[PDB]
Design a protein around this ligand. Structure first.
Ligand SMILES: Cc1cc2c(cc1C)N(C[C@H](O)[C@H](O)[C@H](O)COP(=O)(O)O)c1[nH]c(=O)[nH]c(=O)c1N2
Ligand SMILES: Cc1cc2c(cc1C)N(C[C@H](O)[C@H](O)[C@H](O)COP(=O)(O)O)c1[nH]c(=O)[nH]c(=O)c1N2
Ligand SMILES: Cc1cc2c(cc1C)N(C[C@H](O)[C@H](O)[C@H](O)COP(=O)(O)O)c1[nH]c(=O)[nH]c(=O)c1N2
Ligand SMILES: Cc1cc2c(cc1C)N(C[C@H](O)[C@H](O)[C@H](O)COP(=O)(O)O)c1[nH]c(=O)[nH]c(=O)c1N2
Ligand SMILES: Cc1cc2c(cc1C)N(C[C@H](O)[C@H](O)[C@H](O)COP(=O)(O)O)c1[nH]c(=O)[nH]c(=O)c1N2
Ligand SMILES: Cc1cc2c(cc1C)N(C[C@H](O)[C@H](O)[C@H](O)COP(=O)(O)O)c1[nH]c(=O)[nH]c(=O)c1N2
Ligand SMILES: Cc1cc2c(cc1C)N(C[C@H](O)[C@H](O)[C@H](O)COP(=O)(O)O)c1[nH]c(=O)[nH]c(=O)c1N2
Ligand SMILES: Cc1cc2c(cc1C)N(C[C@H](O)[C@H](O)[C@H](O)COP(=O)(O)O)c1[nH]c(=O)[nH]c(=O)c1N2
Ligand SMILES: CC(C)=CCOP(=O)(O)O
Ligand SMILES: CC(C)=CCOP(=O)(O)O
Ligand SMILES: CC(C)=CCOP(=O)(O)O
Ligand SMILES: CC(C)=CCOP(=O)(O)O
Ligand SMILES: CC(C)=CCOP(=O)(O)O
Ligand SMILES: CC(C)=CCOP(=O)(O)O
Ligand SMILES: CC(C)=CCOP(=O)(O)O
Ligand SMILES: CC(C)=CCOP(=O)(O)O
Lengths: 207, 207, 207, 207, 207, 207, 207, 207
């Protein structure tokens, strides 16, 4: 298999829950193991901008998502915001790639400064110190200079800053087609196969 | 009228022509005067990702857009890429706000470095030296550290970096609803009235 | 196979065309796919400092190089300087390593600043944002502080700055032996097998 | 095999010889090839803080270590401090990962500044220019701002700064258990299998 | 008495509780007054990596520690994480030295950025603004560039960054001997007498 | 006694040996303990610019200086350039103030970069990490930007940069009076009594 | 003649008037034209630390110095502190080298910041903008970080920072011999012949 | 004569001895005086990559080179690595231009940091403080960020960084023709006549 076997997928309180749910579903279909984390604000976003009725507690959540995605048993692990017992809290864990999708400006800040106040922030701190993949998917506009400095710092240290900025070059016809563009970019970044967005120019031999 | 009477709208070669066409139409409906500039790459984008058959030469272009938007005669001015005779080339011109929507990574670079190689780049250089509004709407993912440094420099100097990153908090049902979210943000930035995106929380009196 | 299956090889207007032609030939012999780009200045260099009569237009060029190197059909793709349809223009393309050999001081500048004015510059911009290999082979002396700052910025972001500075530790007897030293270094950087430069010290067991 | 086939292991004059000897032994047991370098100060440390009677000259040293670790013939190569003939002195060598364990503050300084005064420093300079793994294991307290600036510079360039700071979360009962924690972290960094430190949380499915 | 009469000892959630308990005991034996603060994460660390059954609430904690260490009544004060009434919250308090042992990467971050979210962070903020001693004892490996930048900033402002990196030059035979090395370094930094680690070279008169 | 009981006095290869010999004599007369270190270049300076015939080996040197200054037995300790057994090599030593008088540009460099190549450089590295007094007395003209950057870095970290730049405000009549001005400044910096340079203005009550 | 025909010699209020008077005399003997400027504080220094009774007003001063040095009529020009009519105030003047000897910390500050409050400061501002020689001779100890930053800035812009730090390698026997060392260094910097300090090593052919 | 009368030519341990020998020969033919310095590593390079059997000791070396180049007696001075008696060690020496050809990455480092550990490094330190020409000829590939930062610092201070990167625009037919290109560039930098590389375009009057 190309790409990581295990992804830590953290969802934080930016207005783009569709992208994290779609990514979760694609990752499950590519038979990856997902360690799923979600912030309190992200739970309010999902409740108010989607049709998904996500249970509050980690075990009910894990059961719900396993159904929602058609996952295998234990394929999706759910950990709460102070569960330091969970793999992502330590660099001695097995290697996984981490994606924060969507990534709020507050979570971006915490990761840039090293705040480690909850499991998502500590997980990203560990990805950085271990040189493990870390992809942040901000959804904000305008970006202020505070946001941009935090993104630059992290980019300079090897994180991938992948804004939720879909392109129109595959002729999108629906909101779902724009959500899939962003998701396809994330999977490409992670090195995981995808067939939602063709490889640009692959059939063009000469100019 | 709130907001600027005249906007310089430059469209450059990022995959988001829908946003610049929609903005052009909203600006016309709010009876603003638009000085419209478009790059060669942006013409290829529009030809390949939209249904809009935009003529190549500035006078045919001006006639086409005036029809497309329902504008009044002389409401939309079109200037070519080396027309130094046009108002945006000089700080002695009448004040206008400038928006680059969409803004390619190459145009972002040129504006950050001061390259002034064509009328769009010189127009942005003049907006900066005159302290006139300058809004850039990048559409790229990932953003590299080169992109992020160029955005930060410009943000620090007072430009507004407004990525084409729509939110989902107004329940979008179509691609058009996502395009209008971004457009609504731009008009808000410019101080121009809009009724596509409600004022968040305006009716909430207490927590 | 070790190393990348596909290399984007861009030749720009520094006085070292021999190195890019030799690299092209080595890449073909290692059965890699080459996406070949060449600047207008690089065409003048090749015309004046080599015996290679390279045709001007991309399809005639592709036929010429395919012969010159003994390549298989479609092994070498040639794209012109504004062919945005070509794979290297987008990060959604299939992954390839990019080498700019030789790299003029102007191309170094454009890549460091993000100028994206033609397909070579945009290709390098995409390599950077995608975290794909990017090797620059400058040929200039002295290096000014402008050159050195541009190289440092790019090195800091993970590009490899590999100056056309051959060593003499394999006893070179000809101009070709110096050209092959530099080429051997490039292939090593890319992780592609080569037998022009032995592995230093591989038989030395103790001091 | 996961991880590098060949490791350059340099031991320098910080008070932690136990960690470099233990790492050497683990690397031998995982059937890796080790290019072993040791500074004059590190020889005084080993003589005074361990029970290991290490011979002075490279060939006697190689014989001693080969016995001490149970290595195969030629599995451990020993090179002296000015043996420029040895593989680590040149980037044209075969790829290996380099670890400096322990890393004195003086060696940290030399690597950060590019001093290349002996084979260890030149070896690290080459690892950096080749983008090959470089792990530094400092043992000092307090760390001054000079130390911290030197570490930051190197971290920013992709070196791994792994201080000899063992954790207590695997219930250590002996000095050997603390030495093995640090060694286990190094092997994890290098991507080499180890069974001294379990994978944190690997059996935890839900919070 | 040499050294401070009063120490604020904060324990945060890094895997090194042994060092803070040992320091607490040494400080009590040198008849100092200790203002003891402990984070929620540090309570989970102590519960899981030590044999010490520390009560949760500040008054039960104070009674427990007073027994554990043989302290005099009122020698150890315990304050909770939001007790702004406590001396360390204000610069108008009586002078004391502050040690954060162990110091998590999150607490390091908060102190470097000025976050003041709880009493430990505010206490360190006050130590800095008052020019009072502040010693941080991180326990992490690798250190990332985020950690290293946060340490450098604080070192530059006069904090002492004293990693939990014991040396082996006093022939340690047990885990306790390594814990005491680090503790001895802290007491030396604070100017408090200790007889666990001899004064290096004190009897050496000539080379 | 005011000021430190023990001073590490290092003499390095700048053209000002008179100042270090005079300081050594003043320190002995104020009954301080001096740990004396001298570089190979400083030995050549003393041989060629003074009348002092200093023996080469540390024990003969210690006997010579003890006579030259009228010191008590064991008041002056002499350590060689690789004597890591000596107190100044470790921060676990008893506290002393360190003066490098004169300080060559090479020694200034090594201290600024953390090179630790010999006992003087390591001693200064330890003074810095321990927050112990460190006074550097450069003697060079012009100062280049390399020198000035190295001095600034060290000044910013709390070292005292005290150039061998005597003043004329005490009416000097001899070379000895200029040497004593500089020495008086050093003793003032260290907080040690001196009566060579009066306290400026001490008898002036009103303007 | 080697070196400049005209020198602007400014004397400011550091305790080293001997050096500026000696330089003035050497410049006169080498038949240079001197534009002489002196600050109010420098007049108090000269009155209190030398035997030279310098008149207050520019014309009496010019007559006095012309006698003191044996100069030709009009060889020494004296200008007051607000005489903007004088050549050094404008870059349109004839080229001259400028030396500030001695240079107070206040004058160093003004030159580094561009303060131009009097003719000396404006003269130095003009030397810098014209790329004309500018030599500053500070006399201060310790140098603080403010002093060192001001010196570095100016050194980086091409000024020569030449501290009043005499060497002892020409066997000085008097205060005058130390004053002449510094003066000899200044003349060397300016490219003016001098025979007070031999050319180091000029007769040494082999090592 | 145009250009300097005296050149300090230092050869250090990069793989390009041919360039320093050829430069030495050209300098002798232009009747310049050469102060020749060579490092221990450079002696190993010359022994292994050239046919030149250079004696070890300075006087035998001077005799050998005087023969090899056809020099006049005393035209080439040879100084050893610790011969502080030699002119280049002091700024009070007669002015000469300094070239380090080839310049190892270690020597580049030492010059950038001010290390002054041997006569070559001190000579370069003096060139910088005296504002005398300093040309460095590195031979390394890739250049890391450490190398590039060291080059930039020195370039910014006025050193010339002239990499051993020959061009092909004079139709080179041999290894000697590439060596002469680099040498011709160095002589041009120094302002010394050369007829190996024509003046580009000198006969071109119009475009
Ligand atoms: C409905 C709704 C929508 C948004 C938000 C909030 C809510 C309630 N917030 C804000 C954000 O959630 C807030 O600053 C949190 O403190 C983020 O905390 P976490 O990073 O999720 O722990 C938010 N933040 C942001 O960066 N981009 C966005 O698009 C949104 N949209
Ligand atoms: C179809 C198509 C689509 C895109 C592009 C090109 C084409 C042809 N380009 C690239 C870009 O247009 C190129 O780097 C130009 O050089 C930009 O020039 P202007 O800034 O418009 O003058 C591009 N650039 C970018 O920053 N974001 C994008 O989404 C796209 N999409
Ligand atoms: C014959 C010849 C030789 C050279 C050049 C030009 C020509 C015509 N140029 C200059 C360079 O080509 C010019 O600055 C271009 O603008 C570079 O454009 P590209 O980067 O190729 O698009 C050039 N540039 C450089 O960096 N190093 C070199 O060795 C040369 N040699
Ligand atoms: C017994 C003993 C113990 C130590 C040391 C020395 C000796 C002799 N040194 C110092 C160090 O070895 C010295 O600065 C050397 O110059 C380092 O040279 P290398 O980097 O090994 O070539 C030392 N240095 C350090 O960074 N951390 C340490 O723990 C120690 N411990
Ligand atoms: C068992 C255990 C062990 C550790 C941790 C946690 C737990 C539960 N954490 C993490 C840390 O406690 C987390 O990022 C907290 O958010 C830190 O909060 P405080 O700074 O104590 O408020 C942790 N953090 C760190 O910097 N170094 C370490 O050694 C450890 N070890
Ligand atoms: C006679 C004599 C005089 C001087 C020197 C040398 C000699 C031999 N050196 C140079 C210096 O000693 C050289 O760069 C050494 O490498 C410094 O090494 P240490 O720092 O003493 O180990 C020298 N260096 C300096 O910074 N200022 C000076 O005044 C002198 N004077
Ligand atoms: C007797 C005497 C001696 C000194 C001073 C003053 C006096 C009165 N001052 C101080 C200085 O003159 C003061 O800060 C002035 O404001 C400098 O002004 P000018 O730069 O000359 O205009 C002084 N300043 C300094 O930088 N180094 C010194 O050696 C002295 N010595
Ligand atoms: C045969 C051979 C070849 C090279 C080297 C060595 C040897 C032995 N070294 C390395 C270098 O010489 C080493 O880092 C020295 O420590 C440099 O010391 P000096 O700067 O000459 O004192 C080397 N260094 C470099 O920067 N570029 C190179 O091309 C080479 N080539
Ligand atoms: C939760 C936990 C064991 C954190 C310690 O992990 P690491 O040693 O800092 O990578
Ligand atoms: C096209 C033109 C008149 C440019 C000059 O404008 P400005 O004085 O630079 O603002
Ligand atoms: C030519 C083209 C489709 C450019 C867009 O690519 P990407 O989304 O910016 O990587
Ligand atoms: C010892 C030696 C051949 C050094 C040259 O290696 P590289 O070309 O600098 O990687
Ligand atoms: C809890 C309290 C009184 C904080 C104010 O202290 P300070 O004036 O900020 O030192
Ligand atoms: C020579 C020696 C014991 C060095 C270790 O000292 P420290 O622990 O780094 O202060
Ligand atoms: C006193 C005077 C004419 C100042 C103007 O000089 P410049 O044009 O600023 O060089
Ligand atoms: C070898 C020697 C006399 C060094 C002193 O030279 P300089 O005064 O630092 O230029």
């Amino acid at each position: 298999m190309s790409g990581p076997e295990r992804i830590t997928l953290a969802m934080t309180g930016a207005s783009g829950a569709q992208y994290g749910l779609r990514l979760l579903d694609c990752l499950v279909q590519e038979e990856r193991e997902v360690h799923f984390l979600i912030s309190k604000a992200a739970q309010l976003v999902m409740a108010t901008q989607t049709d998904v009725a996500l249970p509050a507690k980690p075990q009910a959540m894990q059961a719900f998502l396993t159904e929602y995605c058609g996952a295998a048993a234990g394929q999706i692990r759910v950990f709460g915001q102070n569960d330091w017992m969970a793999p992502p809290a330590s660099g001695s864990s097995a290697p996984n790639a981490m994606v924060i999708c969507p990534c709020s400006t507050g979570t971006l800040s915490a990761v840039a400064t090293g705040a480690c106040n909850n499991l998502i922030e500590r997980a990203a701190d560990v990805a950085l110190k271990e040189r493990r993949p870390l992809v942040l998917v901000p959804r904000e506009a305008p970006f202020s200079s505070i946001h941009l400095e935090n993104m630059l710092k992290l980019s300079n240290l090897g994180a991938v800053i992948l804004p939720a900025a879909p392109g129109f070059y595959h002729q999108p016809q629906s909101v779902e087609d724009l959500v899939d563009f962003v998701v396809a970019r994330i999977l490409n970044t992670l090195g995981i196969p995808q067939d939602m967005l063709p490889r640009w120019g692959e059939q063009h031999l000469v100019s």
